[PDB]
Amino acid sequence: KLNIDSIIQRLLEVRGSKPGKNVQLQENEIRGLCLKSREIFLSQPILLELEAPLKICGDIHGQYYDLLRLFEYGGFPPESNYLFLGDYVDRGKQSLETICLLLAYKIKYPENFFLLRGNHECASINRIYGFYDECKRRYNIKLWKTFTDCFNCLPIAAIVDEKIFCCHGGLSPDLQSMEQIRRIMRPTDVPDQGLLCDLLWSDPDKDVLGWGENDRGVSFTFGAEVVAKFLHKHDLDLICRAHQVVEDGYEFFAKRQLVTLFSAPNYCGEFDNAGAMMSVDETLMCSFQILKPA
Numbered sequence: 001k002l003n004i005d006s007i008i009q010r011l012l013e014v015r016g017s018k019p020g021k022n023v024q025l026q027e028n029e030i031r032g033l034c035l036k037s038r039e040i041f042l043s044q045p046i047l048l049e050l051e052a053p054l055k056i057c058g059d060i061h062g063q064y065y066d067l068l069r070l071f072e073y074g075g076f077p078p079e080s081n082y083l084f085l086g087d088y089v090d091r092g093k094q095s096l097e098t099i100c101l102l103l104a105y106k107i108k109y110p111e112n113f114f115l116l117r118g119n120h121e122c123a124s125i126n127r128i129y130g131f132y133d134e135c136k137r138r139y140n141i142k143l144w145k146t147f148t149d150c151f152n153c154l155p156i157a158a159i160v161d162e163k164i165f166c167c168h169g170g171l172s173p174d175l176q177s178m179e180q181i182r183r184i185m186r187p188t189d190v191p192d193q194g195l196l197c198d199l200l201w202s203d204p205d206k207d208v209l210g211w212g213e214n215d216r217g218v219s220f221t222f223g224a225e226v227v228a229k230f231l232h233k234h235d236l237d238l239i240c241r242a243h244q245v246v247e248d249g250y251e252f253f254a255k256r257q258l259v260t261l262f263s264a265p266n267y268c269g270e271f272d273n274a275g276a277m278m279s280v281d282e283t284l285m286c287s288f289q290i291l292k293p294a
């Protein structure tokens, strides 16, 4: 029914055009991307088990031309396998093009392209920070609600080669075993505090070794001792997350037991931060590709 190759073709057709140029897909096509990807997300585990080689990206926040630059620098699917950590919409000027290209690739390469849920893939959040407004202006609210139903089915975490735990926010004082994550039911909005909330909102903190207070007004912060206990209990080597804007695009925390990735250069057009993508080769060696704020 859905012509994925044509959709991708039109979305990529703007490579080279002046940044900011829109790609206006038909309402039916976008709705189809949501419904089809939703089916795929539900068919795969909520806790993904992936293998390198892989390219991992952090927050994109509707900066579509920067997403294009990422693919330009890392290789357009299926040239390279990808895992995004969430926060595809809000703040930026082109959340629509951004999320549609990502969903399109998920449908086109379901086994080589993966997307995790960020806190911005939650209705209460993308309703206020831009996505709703973009949908209201370019399409309609019914379509925005359709996106919400899609987002409610996104997976929550992934483990790369049994060594790298990936999630959007961070750890939770309720997280004792991976099975707790696998048992999370979808579709799900994030109505209550707890495990899922923390996985989407928590942040690492340098000042405390254990659990601390989070300035976001939700969830908690976690220190190096918490991370160490986590990694050892599940025989992991690193936690890879996003959620926090970092000046260089990537930054290590908790004595390098954790790395934060942010892929949207000059966030909100008010930061001079760079964007970064982390490459994981087949020998489990990590390298970082930086996107200078252009």
Ligand SMILES: C=C1[C@@H](O)[C@@H]2O[C@]3(CC[C@H](/C=C/[C@@H](C)[C@@H]4CC(C)=C[C@@]5(O[C@H](C[C@@](C)(O)C(=O)O)CC[C@H]5O)O4)O3)CC[C@H]2O[C@@H]1[C@@H](O)C[C@H](C)[C@H]1O[C@@]2(CCCCO2)CC[C@H]1C
Pocket (backbone or CB within 6 Å): 091, 124, 125, 129, 215, 216, 217, 218, 245, 267, 268, 270
């Ligand atoms: C979003 C957020 C948080 O993350 C944010 O955290 C804080 C701590 C660190 C963080 C700083 C971020 C900066 C780098 C950016 C840079 C720029 C240029 C703009 C700005 O942008 C922030 C929002 C956003 C999106 O851009 C983000 O970057 O986070 C707000 C402050 C702005 O100066 O700060 O600011 C404090 C303010 C807090 O404000 C909101 C928070 O009130 C949201 C609230 C908790 C939510 O509660 C509910 C109910 C409970 C469960 C969760 O859902 C419903 C929905 C919503 C009301």
Ligand SMILES: [Mn+2]
Pocket (backbone or CB within 6 Å): 087, 118, 119, 120, 168, 242, 243, 244
């Ligand atoms: Mn986030």
Ligand SMILES: [Mn+2]
Pocket (backbone or CB within 6 Å): 059, 087, 243, 244
């Ligand atoms: Mn973010």
